Design a protein around this nucleic acid. Structure first.
Ligand SMILES: [Zn+2]
Lengths: 69, 203, 101, 140, 141, 119, 53
RNA sequence: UAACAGGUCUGUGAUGCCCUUAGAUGUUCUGGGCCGCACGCGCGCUACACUGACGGAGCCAACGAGUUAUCCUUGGCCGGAAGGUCUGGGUAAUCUUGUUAAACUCCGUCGUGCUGGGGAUAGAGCAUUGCAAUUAUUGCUCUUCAACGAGGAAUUCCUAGUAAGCGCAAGUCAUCAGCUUGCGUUGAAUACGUCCCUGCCCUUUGUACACACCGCCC
């Protein structure tokens, strides 16, 4: 099972854990943490306007993102 | 130079770079594992894996087919998807770019090394005709080696991604990278070892 | 002012061609804007039926074909020449019809 | 004047072109070559353009209409139509040796661009839905 | 995009049924008997509540207004052609089906069709299909 | 006082025809919308004879016919009719509770179920 | 002049048939043929249905 | 070429023979039916999920059919596209029709759990076709919305636009395709071998078989 309680920890964790890896998508974040799917793409969309992640090629199922360098 | 049409410079730069792959170089990749030359068209550069041509008219016409195209053809399994080449091409493209993102070397080189390492060397055919119905150790041809490697990789990817969150492209990429090197975590390599050990046992 | 359109529908290729040749030759004997033959797409009717009178036997289906060929001809002939050529163009197996207006 | 015409087919698909002298303006049914109905089937249309470059195409204006067939049939038809239109233009209006080198270069790197592709589906025979596939026999 | 430190109060009893706490509202409302998919979507849209938030962050006012709208659909400009029951046998009006009432409506319809002793009634008593289906090969075990 | 739509039985006995045809299932109301006793008007009149002849009993003197494909109606209800299920004129005892359904939906023509299982 | 003897019809069976047939099973009304399959097989060549293929 | 003791005397005013013919094994009108089930066997269909489902949007084919009283359909308008409205195109590669299909693709959700994959199954109203739809023609608005979580032993088809998957046209029709015949799209692996299992042809050989090994015989 995957937790979905917004206990103020997930948002801070993902914001400080994005630089750990380069490829960010629903398939890898499920392995990374117990994410139920909604926050999986909501967090990525909310971090898109920030300069942390750079887009490469977006698709309906998934979108490709890379780190700052 | 440009015309009224947009004509993006990516295509022009690709033509200047001796028509490399979609996002990977073509000049500088060759089969390094011995005993599998003259049967994989690594040098035949094609912008897309798909090629609607004749691949079964001759006895050995299959040897000149693109290795990526043959793998897309192997991925055509599961008659639910028998005939959906666009899905297979997208999955292969996503797997290849994920491999490039993971490791810097050419994903085609990863692919060639994976199929070469997976390809069985010693098999065991059945004598039949009742009696002791035993089996004898027999070697196999390079073309059948590629066929076994392609089938084992595809069936392993389907089994791994049959029921899981991970995508088919990701599972295929994981299988290819795990088969290109020796890590003992590849289902295709396990079947390779199993076929070898049973062949030596009945030899 | 008075354009005569005649039909050249039939199934026998030889006899429809002979009728068409006869009227074209007459249209060239007397100049009437020398409009030549016009060919229309073949209307072929395909029907598939069985061969066995009963239900016993293998699944065998027979397909029959029925095709007809149409041609149209436009002429500027007067009434007397039109009635004359129709009188001489009496042939078996050829159906003709003239539309005035 | 300097203009030719040609066509291209891949079975139940047709694409007839009309070459002309110009300074580009290359389009495929209103939309340019860049914008087509599919996205993963773009390099197939781009196959003969990159081999000879765009400098040779800077002196030609061609708009090709496509009608019939599936998506893969249409993209093969349009790329065949533009390729044959270009070689027809360069056969009739520049040196024969230049045409020989262009045709040979296209032949060496040819995804059946120039040569016709006689691919057809065999007629369905009675006894089963498919031409060769048949209903299973209960054998008992 | 939304406030993370929000309020959560697990599940609550509703119409003698349990609505899931940490579950998307579309999924949670299907747990209520008599609710489908388009019905759940339209009643929530007419209730005017944010779709992104799940059922675990709702408040008392929003919960009460949503259920009251469901209790009285036709009064809140909900079209009557969608309603499952129109021109009820007993009520004579397009009454809305619920969860607790359908827990006894099925047996009420069974007694309605059995007391008057139809051919459909004996089919229901004998546990056979009522429509003109076939059971020579199918309808077994 | 309640047969199909909560309207009282006495009211149905002389209600408006349009209202009666409008308070039914679409199938059961299109049935009377497009067909109102084809050649069965004589059957309706014959039942009126039975009602006049024997009003003392809940079921008047038995009257036979050979048609049931119409639903029951309040002005014809409350009688016993002989309907040929194939070898027997079944007594049907029409009741006003189920106004709006045919007679075959309530009677038996073929052997329904249970495999028979004789002894 | 006969009542309840021959019921008039306008649709369904009892409305169309052949001159010497009308079994209503294995009969085609295509192109207004209104003939049985066996009769069509017997006289296919005369009408013009020739097995070209 | 001959072989089946094969099917059709319920296609056939094609027919020999047996039987019946008035209380007709003759014609005909109504109701029940061929579809009625505690099961065994078939040919096809549905999903067993992210390769899917839902939702928007760009759009790419062929073969075929249709009114002389009475079929194929366009256009403005009303609607719960299920219908009906009026002028109307069509006796026809001139009108449906250019049968702008499906599959596919751009984007968002369902996140992996027999759940929004799958609609077995039960109920209430909305219309056309048909003396009229119970034993719900057919679809429609819905709700209840289950088994099944790639299926053992056996068995069937298949060598290139082949299987597989998808859709469309016609047949039967007053209405009803899950069937059949054709078309087109997407589109593979596997062999260019053998008589080893399973059969067919030829030659030699043996025979106590010849309705011919499902034989003869103690
Ligand atoms: Zn017949």
């Amino acid at each position: 099972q995957h937790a979905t309680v917004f206990d103020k920890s997930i948002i801070d964790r993902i914001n400080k854990e994005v630089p750990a890896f380069k490829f960010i998508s629903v398939s890898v974040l499920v392995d990374r943490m117990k994410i139920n799917g909604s926050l999986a793409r909501i967090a990525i969309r909310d971090l898109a306007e920030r300069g942390v992640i750079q887009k490469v090629d977006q698709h309906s199922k998934q979108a490709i993102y890379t780190r700052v360098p | 130079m440009a015309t009224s049409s947009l004509t993006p410079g990516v295509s022009l730069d690709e033509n200047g770079s001796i028509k490399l792959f979609n996002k990977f170089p073509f000049e500088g990749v060759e089969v390094k594992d011995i005993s599998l030359v003259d049967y994989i068209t690594i040098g035949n550069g094609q912008p897309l894996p798909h090629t609607a041509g004749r691949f079964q008219t001759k006895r050995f016409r299959k040897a000149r087919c693109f290795i990526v195209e043959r793998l897309t053809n192997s991925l055509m399994m599961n008659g639910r998807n028998n005939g959906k080449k666009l899905l297979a091409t997208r999955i292969v493209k996503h797997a290849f770019e994920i491999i490039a993102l993971l490791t810097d070397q050419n994903p085609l080189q990863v692919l060639v090394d994976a199929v070469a390492a997976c390809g069985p060397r010693e098999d065991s055919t059945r004598i039949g005709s009742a009696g002791t119905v035993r089996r004898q150790a027999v070697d196999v041809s390079p073309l059948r080696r590629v066929n076994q490697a392609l089938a084992l990789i595809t069936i392993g990817a389907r089994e791994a991604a049959f029921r899981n969150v991970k995508s088919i492209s990701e599972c295929l990429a994981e299988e290819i990278i795990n088969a290109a090197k020796g890590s003992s975590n590849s289902y295709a390599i396990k079947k390779k070892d199993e076929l070898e050990r049973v062949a030596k046992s009945n030899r | 002012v008075h354009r005569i359109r005649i039909t050249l529908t039939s199934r026998n290729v030889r006899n429809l061609e002979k009728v068409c040749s006869d009227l074209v030759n007459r249209a060239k004997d007397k100049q009437l804007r020398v409009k030549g033959p016009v060919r229309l797409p073949t209307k072929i009717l395909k029907i598939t039926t069985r061969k066995t009178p009963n239900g016993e036997g293998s699944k065998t289906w027979e397909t029959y074909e029925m095709r007809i060929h149409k041609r149209l001809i436009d002429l500027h002939s007067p009434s007397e020449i039109v009635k004359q050529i129709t009188s001489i163009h009496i042939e078996p197996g050829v159906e003709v019809e003239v539309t005035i207006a | 004047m300097q203009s030719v015409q040609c066509f291209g087919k891949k079975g139940n698909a047709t694409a007839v072109a009309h070459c002309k002298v110009g300074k580009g303006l290359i389009k495929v049914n209103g939309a340019p070559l860049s914008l087509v109905q599919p996205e993963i089937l773009r390099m197939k249309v781009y196959e003969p353009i990159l081999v000879a470059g765009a400098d040779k195409f800077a002196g030609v204006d061609i708009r090709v209409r496509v009608s019939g067939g599936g998506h893969v049939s249409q993209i093969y038809a349009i790329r065949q139509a533009i390729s044959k239109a270009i070689v027809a233009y360069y056969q009739k209006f520049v040196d024969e040796h230049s045409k020989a080198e262009l045709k040979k270069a296209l032949i060496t790197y040819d995804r059946t661009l120039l040569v016709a592709d006689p691919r057809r589906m065999e007629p369905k025979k009675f006894g089963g839905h498919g031409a060769r596939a048949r209903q299973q026999k209960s054998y008992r | 995009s939304l406030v993370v430190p929000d309020n959560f109060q697990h599940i609550l009893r509703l119409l003698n049924t349990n609505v899931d706490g940490k579950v998307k509202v579309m999924f949670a409302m299907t747990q209520i008997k008599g609710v489908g998919r388009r019905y759940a979507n339209i009643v929530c849209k007419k209730a005017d509540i944010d779709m992104s938030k799940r059922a675990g962050e709702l408040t008392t006012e929003e919960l009460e207004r949503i259920v009251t709208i469901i209790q009285n659909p036709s009064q809140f400009k909900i079209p009557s052609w969608f309603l499952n029951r129109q021109k009820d046998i007993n009520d004579g009006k397009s009454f809305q089906l619920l969860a607790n009432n359908v827990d006894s409506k099925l047996r009420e319809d069974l007694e309605r069709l059995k007391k008057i002793q139809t051919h459909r009634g004996l089919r229901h008593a004998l546990d056979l299909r009522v429509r003109g289906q076939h059971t020579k090969t199918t309808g077994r075990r | 006082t309640f047969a199909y739509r909560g309207v009282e039985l006495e009211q149905l006995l002389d209600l408006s025809a349009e209202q009666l045809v409008d308070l039914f299932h679409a199938r059961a109301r299109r049935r009377m919308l497009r067909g109102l006793g084809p050649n069965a008007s004589r059957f309706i009149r014959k039942l009126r004879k039975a009602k006049s002849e024997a009003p003392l009993n809940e079921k008047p003197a038995t009257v036979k016919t050979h048609l049931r494909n119409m639903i029951i109606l309040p002005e014809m209800v409350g009688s016993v009719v002989g309907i040929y299920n194939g070898k027997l004129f079944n007594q049907v005892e029409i009741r006003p509770e189920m106004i709006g359904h045919y007679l075959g939906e309530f009677s038996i023509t073929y052997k329904p179920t249970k495999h028979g299982r004789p002894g | 002049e006969n009542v309840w003897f021959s019921h008039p019809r306008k649709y369904g069976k009892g409305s169309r048939q052949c001159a010497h047939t009308g079994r209503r099973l294995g009969l085609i009304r295509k192109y207004g043929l209104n003939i049985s399959r066996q009769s069509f097989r017997e006289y296919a060549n005369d009408i013009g249905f020739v097995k070209y293929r």
